[PDB]
Design an enzyme around this catalytic site. Structure first.
Site, PDB file in Angstrom:
ATOM      1  N   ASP C  54       0.843  -1.208   0.000  1.00  0.00           N
ATOM      2  CA  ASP C  54       0.000   0.000   0.000  1.00  0.00           C
ATOM      3  C   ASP C  54       0.876   1.256   0.000  1.00  0.00           C
ATOM      4  O   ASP C  54       1.528   1.567   1.002  1.00  0.00           O
ATOM      5  CB  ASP C  54      -0.945  -0.055   1.208  1.00  0.00           C
ATOM      6  CG  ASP C  54      -1.853   1.175   1.280  1.00  0.00           C
ATOM      7  OD1 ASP C  54      -2.654   1.371   0.346  1.00  0.00           O
ATOM      8  OD2 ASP C  54      -1.566   2.038   2.128  1.00  0.00           O
ATOM      9  N   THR C  87      -3.338   4.443  -5.104  1.00  0.00           N
ATOM     10  CA  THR C  87      -2.146   4.933  -4.387  1.00  0.00           C
ATOM     11  C   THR C  87      -0.880   4.857  -5.247  1.00  0.00           C
ATOM     12  O   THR C  87      -0.436   5.865  -5.792  1.00  0.00           O
ATOM     13  CB  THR C  87      -1.908   4.144  -3.087  1.00  0.00           C
ATOM     14  OG1 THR C  87      -1.916   2.738  -3.370  1.00  0.00           O
ATOM     15  CG2 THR C  87      -2.991   4.457  -2.066  1.00  0.00           C
TER      16      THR C  87
END
Lengths: 513, 513, 513
Positions: C54, C87
């Site tokens: 992430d 992201t």
């Protein structure tokens, strides 16, 4: 293998480092590119500084560290030797190719494909240049003076490129013989501060910066019989050890008078051959100088070996090691050999020879560094004029070639396909930096000239385009006399692409302790 | 390329740095500008200090670091060689031009336009000077003494500029021959502390600071037959190794008497040619000195090679390497050769020659550093007087030229247009610094003189204006005899503008390890 | 302004440095891109290490120095807040855009044009995405589970993406209410080591990791009346200073028994409202815990403020500050409130509420760092499923969008023209890095997939293409359920392009002492 502290590069680092070496050189050199290119200020360890735009002068004098840059220098040197020009050009496209190389390496194009695409595009570029080349009269007065001048431009000397073109075209045509092969060693570049650049002039023969060893000697000799000696005109000593043992004050004089006879006999031997001009690479005895003057022989001593050779070429004079070895067959002919003082200094002019094979160019100007810059400028002018005679094809300047190469190598890339087409496509992209930076240094828009010139070249042709940085717009380079020898640009790309690939060939750097 | 610690300048930094180098030199040198210019105190590594106002002396002796300043020096040197004067002038306007250059670089005028505008304005400035130049009699007594004096002013020697003008005008007219070409090497500047500057006087021939090697020799010889030898008058040894082997005390004497005969024969050979004055570049054997005196030959030994050459020029005496090589044709003539002691020291005067081609100026004064300053002052006076004869045009001083250049190059700028007109406009602005700083050093108002002199020049003309720093107001420079040779100011701007542009040509400094 | 040692960047250096900051982040983050993206190992100052893919987690936890990277982080954060995903995507294209930016800056495209072209291409990209978007049923079971799973892929949790899609789709549909607006705070991600990922399950209500404060309390309460207190259930002291003064041992007991009555009355007040479940944010007195058990009230103390809020959402229970402030209207309803021990630890399940507005997801797995990685994986799954409901359009994955953007923004560039078309052309080039690096991380050929996928997309369409890194070949992303919410990719490019330009907006960095 490497001593603690020694740095080692491998794989992506060896390639990046080599690209960085060539790119940094290219980043420095690319600012010299074109008629509006700038100068570099090279300052040595002793404080002596030289200002130049010549890629070779720059690279030789600067203290290079990266071995990759050291191999690129060989391109700049073989450029000067083979064609004269194309120094900046070859280095710039080399560094650009290297920049593109890493892009391809990162984009999943294997280094063996990158070096394949560059070799392939360069091989096609050779064919493209041979077919785009514009045939021209090898000895055509006009093209010769146009090649000369266009080479001169971007240098300080261009203010008198007209007089210089006339001088260099005449010099090359003389020494080149056939159409042809030129020897740059037959054209000497002499320089002496004083007067202006307009006063620079060609001497059909050899000019040396020497004086007449005796004030008793003639200051001018016509229908001259030139003899070249390399030994000194002095009392020789034998190989075997020997000493004179004087037993009488009359006998001391017996020898003194024998050395007088000896030096007289040395001069008598020169005279016996029929010589009346004498250039000695070594010294001449003070007494022998008088004897030389007595026989009406004009003479200069301590002549540079290079000067002795230029004299041999022009007059057909034969450099003889031993005075005893002189014969009539060793004499050269000159129309006039005369001692002249220009800007205070004595120099001897050997001119108007029967069939001079060597000539001298006397450069004048208001400063030593100006006539120094001029000397470099005209050195290239000789080269490129020789290139046009050696191969009777010339090409349009203003980036027209490199644009043709972009257009056709991008088409070539399509035939190649695979990842190999990206290598060829990138090769063509790198070659575009010249059209781009020619005008970059002029302060012109890289974007506008890129689109308009590309379209103008592609539509109008090769000898009907190119970018003129002097007006800041696309023009007709051929009509405007903005052309360079085929040899320059073909050798430039060939050597540049080869040395670039060579740099791309290395995957690991090993430094010895 | 550069060793860790070596500094590198590029683009705006290379240009700023080069401007800073030239500007700092110009900032130092501009304070010497004009009749009211000041002096510089140059102290070397050994403690020996020289005080001067001469731009060349200052720049040569000082330890310069910046290569840009090293190229500007070439302007100051070629100024002294070509015209004599214009040292300060050329340097000052060069640094000013450089200051303006960065203004234009920042104002969005590309460096290729800046160097174009300066070259263009300087090319027009050459035409402007050739057309503003005021024709004058090349050998006119009046203009010659006026040129001489105006060059002398701003120096300590100006207290006797009248006597010095008379001396230098006579010397130049003698050695210049035609109208003309002058050789400054034919006019020697000798100096000897003692007396005053009013006692300085010209000797029509050569003065050397030597003595008669024997007290038995005449102290004065008329209708002199001068012989020049460069070897020593001693017992020569042969090239081949040889030694005497004495077998009898009578035989030891046999040789001793032979060396007596030898040195006698050496003198007898000088006598045989008809010589009665003898200058030997090397030594003279004590016995030979007696033999010389016996034959009535006056002689001096260890004569400076320069002195031997001046003697050859004046008398027509021929420097001979070997004594045996002497002949009657090697003799020079002098009206009188006489040994005189001035301020205690012995010096030989060779004067009143038949047709002297070289003269000597004997400078007197209360201190060595005064007559040193005078020697420099008159060196320039010779140059500029020669300039007026070589080219029979002179120009008004007091900044009148530079004001004409401002007025007409500002008009020239209008014809040029574009950003190129700002380059020409700035060129003219830089040339204004001379009118400005001429009076700056006088303590006059730069503002008032700028407006009033500009208007006065523009309205009244060229030979009917200029600023007189001596009264601190606009005057008539031509009427007041404040004029300089065309050559001085034309060469000054030409070389100054060219070296300035040269500095502006460099975009990158590469220092070798 | 800056302290000696503080570094300052300006012009080309400020832009290069900012590009280097964003590119270095992008160079690190781009390796996480795609289903075959890798992991990062982030080790803090204390030794505690987290492994993740992430972008947000990576950028937040790492100790960033460059302010340019600090602004890019805001994109990754607003990505997680607004859409959940995108992201890596946004960061990667941002760094790529920056790389292209300097190319254009060097190629004579002014920074104001570069930022214009990026803003322009991004504005067109918004239209392009809105028109390429494929309409889908906002609550369609199938698309919801497909969005969920495709977001999960490239993470360790994908092994159970089927169970996770079912869990997350149900959770979002519950809390999203209409079609729609989702609040991610209504879906709690709880994790407890033990069991496997297949055992992860959704609880329709709130799960807290608390215990029943007394062993005398029921372990399960049905039709529960939940009361939320934030103060402690202890003997309060007044604001005004007060102390008890005991005068009798019976009176000591008089107070002791009053505190017994007090705590009893506190419990009696909870009972009086009708509550039988009690969550206290603060502590509960040992005696009061007994009284709570006496009235059949199940209770837990020291409840996390976050847990108190989730309970309020689900049950409709009202957190009350003061015990006296309790009323019947402050009670929430739950079907069952029961104390359960899973993997040894006590946790209370509040489930089967009337109309739960908040749910809890209990994650199981063989290790804490596995269920930690799963917790992050499903956090995004909630976001993206919410995105599909909030806006009923989804788009094909496998770089199909970015390929559409390349194709159409390259056409857009043509309409723009000038140097602005190169800015738009470079923008499109940068957006291509995603298709390229998606497969780069899979170990697929960037060259082959670039040509074949581009042609396949351009010919076959948008919902009939894309690259499938799982088979290593072009496929039908739509047919294979490889789709993401329109919001993700539209917000990703928008914010990425805006922050990139922002970085390109700065021309000078000023650091305070």
């Amino acid at each position: 293998v490497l001593p603690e502290n020694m740095k080692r590069y491998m794989g992506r680092d060896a390639q990046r480092m080599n690209i960085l070496a060539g790119r940094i050189i290219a980043e420095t050199v690319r600012s010299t590119l074109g008629p509006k290119g700038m100068d570099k200020m090279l300052v040595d360890d002793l404080g002596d500084v030289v200002v130049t735009n010549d890629g070779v002068t720059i690279l030789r004098e600067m203290s290079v560290e990266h071995p990759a840059a050291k191999m690129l220098i060989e391109v700049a040197k073989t450029q000067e030797k083979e064609v004269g020009d194309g120094t900046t050009t070859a280095v710039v496209v080399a560094g650009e190719l290297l920049r593109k190389a890493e892009e391809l390496l990162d984009q999943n194009v294997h280094p063996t494909i990158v070096v394949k695409g560059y070799q392939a595009a360069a091989q096609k570029a050779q064919e493209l240049l041979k077919t785009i080349a514009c045939e021209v009269g090898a000895q055509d007065k006009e093209i010769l003076t146009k090649i000369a001048m266009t080479s001169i431009t971007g240098k300080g000397a261009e203010k008198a490129k007209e007089k210089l073109a006339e001088i260099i075209v005449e010099a090359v045509s003389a020494v080149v013989d056939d159409e042809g092969k030129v020897d740059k060693d037959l054209i000497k570049i002499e320089k002496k501060s004083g007067a202006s650049i307009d006063d620079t002039e060609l001497i059909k023969g050899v000019l040396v910066d020497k004086e007449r060893v005796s004030a008793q000697m003639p200051k001018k000799v016509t229908d001259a019989k030139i003899a070249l000696l390399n030994c000194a005109i002095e009392i020789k000593e034998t190989e075997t050890d020997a000493e004179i043992r004087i037993t009488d004050p009359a006998k001391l004089m017996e020898f003194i008078e024998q050395e007088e006879k000896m030096l007289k006999d040395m001069v008598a031997e020169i005279k016996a051959s029929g010589a009346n001009v004498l250039f000695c690479q070594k010294g001449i005895d003070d007494l022998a100088q008088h004897y030389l003057a007595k026989e009406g022989i004009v003479a200069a001593r301590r002549v540079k070996k290079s000067d002795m050779e230029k004299l041999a070429k022009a007059t057909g004079a034969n450099v003889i090691a031993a005075i005893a070895a002189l014969s009539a067959q060793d004499l050269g002919d000159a129309g006039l050999v005369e001692e002249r003082k220009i800007s205070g200094d004595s120099m001897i002019f050997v001119e108007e020879c029967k069939h001079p094979k060597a000539v001298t160019m006397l450069i004048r100007g208001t400063t030593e560094h100006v006539i120094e810059e001029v000397a470099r400028a005209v050195d290239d002018a000789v080269g490129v004029v020789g290139c046009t005679i050696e191969d009777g094809r010339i090409v349009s300047g203003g980036g027209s070639t490199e644009v043709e190469l972009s257009m056709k190598l991008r088409e070539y890339a399509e035939g190649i396909s695979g990842r190999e087409q990206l290598a060829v496509r990138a090769f063509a992209d790198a070659l575009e930096v010249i059209p781009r930076t020619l005008a970059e240094n002029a302060g012109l828009d890289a974007i506008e000239i890129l689109v308009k010139v590309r379209a103008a070249h592609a539509s109008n042709g090769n000898k009907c385009a190119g970018l003129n940085v002097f007006t800041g717009a696309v023009e007709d380079m051929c009509e405007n006399g903005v052309v360079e020898p085929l040899r320059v640009k073909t050798q430039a790309i060939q050597s540049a692409a080869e040395s670039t690939e060579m740099l791309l060939r290395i995957d690991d750097v090993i430094a010895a302790e």
